[PDB]
Amino acid sequence: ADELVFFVNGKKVVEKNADPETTLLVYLRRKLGLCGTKLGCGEGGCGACTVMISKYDRLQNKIVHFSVNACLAPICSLHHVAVTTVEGIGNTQKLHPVQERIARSHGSQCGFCTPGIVMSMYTLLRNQPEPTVEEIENAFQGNLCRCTGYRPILQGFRTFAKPSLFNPEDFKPLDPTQEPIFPPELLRLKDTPQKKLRFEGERVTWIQASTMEELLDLKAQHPDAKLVVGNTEIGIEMKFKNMLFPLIVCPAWIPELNSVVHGPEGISFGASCPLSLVESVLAEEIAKLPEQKTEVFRGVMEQLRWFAGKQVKSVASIGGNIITASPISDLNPVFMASGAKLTLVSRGTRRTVRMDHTFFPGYRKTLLRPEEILLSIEIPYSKEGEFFSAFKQASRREDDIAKVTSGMRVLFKPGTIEVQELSLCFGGMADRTISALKTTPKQLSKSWNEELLQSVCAGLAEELQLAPDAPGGMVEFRRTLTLSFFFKFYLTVLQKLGRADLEDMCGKLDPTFASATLLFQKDPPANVQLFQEVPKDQSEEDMVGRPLPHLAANMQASGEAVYCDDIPRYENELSLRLVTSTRAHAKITSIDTSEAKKVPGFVCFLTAEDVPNSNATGLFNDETVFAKDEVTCVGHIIGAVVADTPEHAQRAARGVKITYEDLPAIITIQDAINNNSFYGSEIKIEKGDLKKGFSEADNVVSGELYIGGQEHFYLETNCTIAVPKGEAGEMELFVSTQNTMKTQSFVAKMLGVPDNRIVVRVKRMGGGFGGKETRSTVVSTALALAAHKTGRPVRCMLDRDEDMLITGGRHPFLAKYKVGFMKTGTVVALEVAHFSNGGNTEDLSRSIMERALFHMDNAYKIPNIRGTGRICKTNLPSNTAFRGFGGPQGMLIAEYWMSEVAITCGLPAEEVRRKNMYKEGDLTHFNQKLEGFTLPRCWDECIASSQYLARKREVEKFNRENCWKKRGLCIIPTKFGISFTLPFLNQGGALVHVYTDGSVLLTHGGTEMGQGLHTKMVQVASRALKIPTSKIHISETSTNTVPNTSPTAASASADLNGQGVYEACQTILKRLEPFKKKKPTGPWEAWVMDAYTSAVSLSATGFYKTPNLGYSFETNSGNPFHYFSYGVACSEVEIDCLTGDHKNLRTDIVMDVGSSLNPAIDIGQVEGAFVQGLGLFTMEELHYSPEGSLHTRGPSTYKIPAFGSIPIEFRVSLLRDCPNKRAIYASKAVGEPPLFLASSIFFAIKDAIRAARAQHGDNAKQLFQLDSPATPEKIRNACVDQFTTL
């Protein structure tokens, strides 16, 4: 047969021409129109595409349910299953309890991740209707959220387990009988024998094998045939490595490859057994068998713990990981260390091998012959006197690629501590899984003692040598990890020998060493959210200050909320694919499109030649729409392929051959300094007398700090649909952008038409964070050109890898500082030179440097101060706005030298910070007066509520009692100026209509990107008009309703639009006045109808400009900011001194948001911003080749905070009784200010490292270096000890 048959949300799908290259995600969205399931990365990392699969399992004889990544599931693997998507469980007319709870608990902000998270939770409940808190958290190991900070999702879902922001009492109960039926046809079909299927696509043939005979016959006849089981490797090879396997065979149905057999020597799993089944089988065995038999099983389980998430483990096979033979496989070192038994078969042949060095003979290769397949692996029981450990250290604990991964085994001669067998196996130390074959034989018959410890360590350091240029990098850290892993194993074995009554032979473990051997333990979360109740007299219809949920939260949880790519395609719609430079700096010498033209559906390749008017674009007119003559970064857009489908556009884009002639490249900040390659002149703020200040200072400290950049990772990538109207150059664009005005202007300029022809529309974005303030236009202009040229609508949504490459991120910073201070810790002089890496266009870089300079004081009054900044012009993708906009970088530098002041003085850091803090009425270094200065209030409240002083006691105690784990604790304040640094951008507009039914249609210039702006504006309008929010609607943002709008940026959008909305509403109220006076108690609808029939206008514009702004750098006078935001965070961490990993133990935040417009949204923004800062300072790192090519292009390599990354105790309080009269209804902006507060984690880590260096350092440098981000690499390398010195 050859028809593909499956079910989607209960409806039968019959696909008569299934293409093997078609994924479930593409089929759902494009063939079926079910756009609740999202594309977020296409590589298994984000979980946005999570759906549920149900099938009758013939082996277990029962209906089973599991989650999968739709982005990686071939539809050809799904014959006779039942798919459930977000649409299949409920909708806004009848929400599933999972959907209701995430929406009402404020667990959905931008909403792009919500369906995937809903589906992960839904699947858990279908398997376990009463899960534990631990099981809930484990459900989301493969789900990412960039907006929420995770807290509210887990807190809302905790209600399923075992004023206020929400009320669990109001949540409807679960009734499992109301879930969708398992399609009866599938139960009928489970009696029919499985038959071989053949699917033939455009390039690939897929054979679904029903028997072992069929599989072996096929591999004998065609050894080239590619086995696919879970597709979690092959899917990535095809999508990202441009590999094509024209013949595929799926053996997933074969009983022999799915069997679990218990034998006398161990448990044998068929090679196609999903890792989820291995987990559940081994878990059962560990619980029921004696400890001494399960050492290997527990080692496998420890690795699987940090192996992807539920979606990948549902389909990823044990054999798949083995045969892939990646050097960083987490299972292969464990299988090698335990000498696991592998059965291999072909037609006519059967053999059994023990996994050792011989099994992996080269990079990504095995002992298998081309015609052979792996049948099974026996995972062995452990013996008496046999102990096992497994280790993994990556960049992030959860869902990540190991830097070093290991399996370690020791067997003792009975009744002794003498070594019979020793096996130490490693991933990430060579081009394959290797055994330490030279080191281990030398230890045989030795006693387990200090001498064996040092002997092995000396051996490992010599045997597992890394060249400085080894793939994977981080060579010092990796070498240190191999030694540290063995040390942990050595101490663990000492403990296990003690428990076997051999403690008098091997000796006791020092009690201060015990914590080194503990397996990672989570500890149950504790959250407190505190805010202020509204006045008792306040109307119940007045929602300002009330925790109203995001207006779209229900639709976002149900996948009914429409993002750009969810808009249905026109019948005549075309797809565009950008073609980008693979060189940092080169001449384009020729472009060959010969192969592109051969791709079916190819329309055209657009270049600079095709631009009708102007190829000069960008904020400072220094960018090209399409490259001309030269390319100036890797990612530089050269042209755009147009084709009928996205698949054909991608294929054709690969057929565009470019020839380059390299030109001298400038990559790093130092490169630019050496070449005088900058954007404009030096920027400078200076006050007081520096020479006097430094002479008067008791102490002077100088240093440098590097701060890495940051990728936005908005869950929805850049996307534009451009619809040409065929008249008068008219065009309408639907765009994921924070900047409708620039999108419009840039498109019009390129086309050579007036602004009045071009309409830009934004309903909502799946995140922006600054990344869509300008850089969205590089996609929009290209798509607009395609639409103009063809006269057809054209669409482009960037793949994650394209988006990360092209669109830039936060500016990396280099700082050179010199600070003068008294022995009391009072700072008297400060000189800082800032350098930023701007990339290949100016964009927002100079304003970002201005803000950094505006915040170089952080919270501290400094009488003699000089800050300079220079923006480097380099051959890298242009860097841009990112939440904070230079502020976090400037403030981290301030806190960095401040930490060194306190250490040099020998004084408590909090005391040094407090005594240097501004007071009410002080002037900043830029001469703005600090009025309504609430920072001391935030500080005192945070000190008290966090119990900082009592916890300092406990941290010091912990550090004296533990040698290999250390705690750290820090409290950090912040001041953040609110307003665009460019004065005229501080304006906003609104337009309001009242229809004759009394309903109100409102729009304003701000765009919704998850920050709950529309919700806030509806709350504002409802208070202003004195009508319930139910009568007011906002549908979208568009340039033809409100023109000349500033970007939704600078945290200012609620302030600016709120005032505009307010004014528009006041105009309407003014007009209704005479009708209100005539009918004082008559309803709103009567006034409206009376006004209409009296021919009074029911439409009005509203407008606001922020008064009295305008700073001069020439004279250091004038106010850049309308007001300041203030906040304080105290954070505690615990570091693993042997691995560089750490736990975020507790964070307490007190934030001044004025009289919050909406405390639910505001606490959400505090939490979201904080966790992005947590990422910036501790986790997120971009890596480039020496030639300037970004290596880090997806969630596999770029590690944003995970569910498990957040502080275990997470407390947020909004300051009470602090109205801010100058902004809308006494509120304050909240978007960017809390982000820097995550530096409290950075400095807590620095505190913990200091303690570690005091413990094991040999006269270590006191003012040691810790650049940002403080990653496991930097943490571990800074913990100098006997292992780092070896």
Ligand X SMILES: O=c1[nH]c(=O)c2[nH]c(=O)[nH]c2[nH]1
* Binds ligand X (CB under 6 A): choice among 981, 1213, 1271, 1277: 981
Name the 3-class secondary structure at 716: coil
Query: Restricting to residues 11-40, which ones interact with a copy of itself according to CB under 8 A?
Result: 33
Q: Candidates 71-79, 386-394, 878-886, 1100-1108: pick the segment binding ligand X (CB under 6 A).
A: 878-886
Helix (H, G, I), strand (E, B) or coil at 699: strand
Residues 664, 584: Cα–Cα separation, whole Å? 9
Q: Name 867's bridge partners.
A: 685, 832
- When CB distances are held under 5 to 8 angstroms depending on the partner's kind, the choice from ligand FAD, a copy of itself, ligand X, none that residue 41 binds is none
Q: What residues pair up with 1154 in beta bridges, in sequence order?
A: 1227
Which residue in the list 100, 386, 1232, 1273 is annotated as catalytic?
1232
The phi-psi region of residue 929 (left if phi > 0; otherwise alpha if psi is between -120 and 50; otherwise beta) is beta
Q: Which of 902, 941, 936 is nearest to 922 (CA)?
A: 936
Helix (H) or strand (E) holding 1278: helix 1272-1278
Helices (H), 146-290: 151-157, 184-189, 212-221, 234-240, 275-288
Q: How many residues bind ligand NAI (CB under 6 A)?
A: 18
- The length of the chain in residues reads 1286
230 is in an annotated binding site: yes
231 is in an annotated binding site: yes
- What is d(CA 935, CA 937) in angstroms, rounded to the nearest whole number? 5
**DSSP-assigned letters across all residues of 477-495:** HHHHHHHHHHHHHHHHHHH
Among 484, 777, 847, 1147, binds ligand X (CB under 6 A): 847
- b/e 206-217 (16+ beta carbons within 10 angstroms → b): bbbbbbbebbbe
Q: Is the peptide bond before 264 cis (omega within 30 degrees of 0)?
A: no
The answer to the question of residue 226 lying near ligand FAD (CB under 6 A) is yes
Residue 396 site contact among a copy of itself, ligand X, Ca ion, none (CB < 5 to 8 Å, cut-off depends on kind): none
Restricting to residues 92-121, name those near ligand FES by CB under 6 A. 108-113
- Residues pairing with 819 in the sheet: 701, 830
Helices (H), 777-875: 777-790, 800-806, 845-854
**Residue 557 is a binding residue for a copy of itself (CB under 8 A):** no
CB 1091 within 8 A of CB 1080: no
Partner that binds at residue 399, options ligand X, ligand FAD, ligand FES, none, CB closer than 5 to 8 Å by kind? ligand FAD
Binding status of residue 771 toward ligand NAI by CB under 6 A: no
Q: How far is the CB of 707 from ligand X (least distance, A)?
A: 17
Residue 935 in contact with residue 859, Cβ under 8 Å? yes
Q: Lay out the site mask for ligand X across 885-924 (x = CB under 6 A, - = otherwise).
A: x---------------------------------------
Cβ neighbour number for residue 703 with a 10 Å cutoff: 15
Inter-residue contact 466 to 475 (CB < 8 Å): yes
Beta-carbon count within 10 A of 941 CB: 18
Q: Is 842 a catalytic residue?
A: no
Q: Say if residue 250 carries a ligand binding annotation.
A: no
Among 881, 891, 1169, 1208, binds ligand X (CB under 6 A): 881
Q: Should residue 329 be labelled a site residue for a copy of itself when binding is judged by CB under 8 A?
A: no
Of positions 373, 750, 1049, 1068, contacts ligand FAD by CB under 6 A: 373
Q: Which is nearer to a copy of itself, 809 or 989 (CB)?
A: 989
Site for ligand NAI in 1081-1110 (CB under 6 A): none
Q: How far is the CB of 975 from ligand X (least distance, A)?
A: 14
Positions 565 through 624 that interact with a copy of itself (CB under 8 A): 568-573
Tokens of 1055: 């302030």
The smaller minimum CB distance to ligand FAD, of residues 39 and 374, is found at 374
Task: Give the one residue of 4, 26, 34, 39 binding ligand FES; rule: CB under 6 A.
Answer: 39
Residue ranges in 1194-1233 that form contacts with ligand NAI under rule CB under 6 A: 1196
Interface pick for ligand NAI out of 32, 133, 161, 430 (rule CB under 6 A): 430
Beta-sheet strand order (sheet of 226-227)? 197-200, 205-208, 247-250, 226-227
Which of 223, 414, 471, 791: binder of ligand NAI (CB under 6 A)? Answer: 471
Find which of ligand NAI, Ca ion, ligand FES, none residue 327 binds, CB within 5 to 8 Å per kind: ligand NAI
What part of residues 997-1036 is at the interface with a copy of itself (CB under 8 A)?
997, 999-1001, 1003, 1031-1033, 1035
3-class state of residue 578 by DSSP: strand
Q: Which tokens belong to 595?
A: 């192969």
Indicate the residue among 486 and 746 with the shorter CB distance to ligand NAI.
486
- Going across the sheet that includes 586-592, the strands are 630-631, 586-592, 657-662
Of 133-141, 326-334, 409-417, 1207-1215, the window that binds ligand FAD (rule: CB under 6 A) is: 326-334
| Binding to Ca ion in span 822-841, by CB under 5 A | 838-839
- The answer to whether 1114 is annotated as binding is no
- Out of 53, 82, 119, 374, which residue is the one contacting ligand FAD (CB under 6 A)? 374
Q: Of ligand FAD, ligand FES, ligand NAI, none, which one does residue 472 interact with (CB within 5 to 8 Å by kind)?
A: ligand NAI
CB 1234 → ligand X: shortest distance, Å?
A: 14
Token code pair at residue 798: 């960037």
Distance CA 975, CA 77 (A): 55
Closest CA to 319 of 350, 344, 298: 344
Hey, what are 910's tokens? 């909090």
CB of 1156 to ligand FES, least distance (A): 20
Query: What are the angstrom distances between the C-alpha of 124 and each of 40, 544, 1223?
Result: 22, 37, 45
Nearer to ligand X (CB atom), residue 647 or residue 1232: 1232
φ, ψ of residue 1031 to 5 degrees: the values are -90, 0
The answer to the question of residue 331 lying near ligand FAD (CB under 6 A) is yes
738 is in an annotated binding site: yes
Segment contacting ligand X by CB under 6 A, of 31-39, 702-710, 879-887, 947-955: 879-887
Q: Which amino acid is at 542?
A: D
Note whether 1251 and 567 are within 8 A (CB): no
Residues 6+ apart with CB under 8 A from 1177: 892, 1238, 1239, 1241, 1242, 1268, 1269, 1270
CB of 313 to ligand FAD, least distance (A): 8
Q: Is 324 in the site for ligand FAD (CB under 6 A)?
A: yes
Looking at beta carbons only, is 432 or 883 nearer to Ca ion? 883
**Would you say 374 is a known binding-site residue?**
yes
Is residue 116 within 8 Å of residue 139, measured between CB atoms?
Answer: no
User: Helix, strand, or coil here: 503?
Assistant: helix
Q: Shortest CA distance to 930 belongs to which of 921, 938, 939?
A: 921
Please state, in angstroms and as integers, the Cα–Cα distance from residue 111 to each residue in 310, 563, 1129, following that order: 21, 10, 27
908 in helix, strand or coil? coil
Cβ-in-10-Å burial (0-12, 13-18, 19+) of 262 comes to exposed
Identify which of residues 40 and 808 has a Cβ nearer to ligand FES in the complex. 40
Q: Using CB under 6 A as the criterion, which residues of the chain lie in contact with ligand FES when the complex forms?
A: 39-42, 44-49, 69, 71, 108-113, 145-148, 715, 767, 1010
Annotated binding site for Mo-molybdopterin: 738, 769, 883, 1050
Q: Using CB under 6 A as the criterion, which residues of the chain lie in contact with ligand FAD when the complex forms?
A: 44-45, 226-234, 271-272, 307-308, 312, 315-317, 319-321, 323-324, 329-331, 373-374, 399
Q: Using CB under 5 A as the criterion, which residues of the chain lie in contact with Ca ion when the complex forms?
A: 838-839, 843, 845, 878-879
Q: Using CB under 6 A as the criterion, which residues of the chain lie in contact with ligand X when the complex forms?
A: 770, 773, 844, 847, 851, 881, 883, 885, 980-981, 1049-1050, 1232
Annotated binding site for [2Fe-2S] cluster: 41, 46, 49, 71, 110, 113, 145, 147
- Which residues participate in catalysis according to the annotation? 1232
Q: Using CB under 8 A as the criterion, which residues of the chain lie in contact with a copy of itself when the complex forms?
A: 33, 560-562, 568-573, 725-728, 730, 741, 744-745, 748, 754-757, 759, 792-793, 984, 986-987, 989, 991, 993-997, 999-1001, 1003, 1031-1033, 1035, 1040-1044, 1093-1095, 1097-1101, 1103, 1105-1106
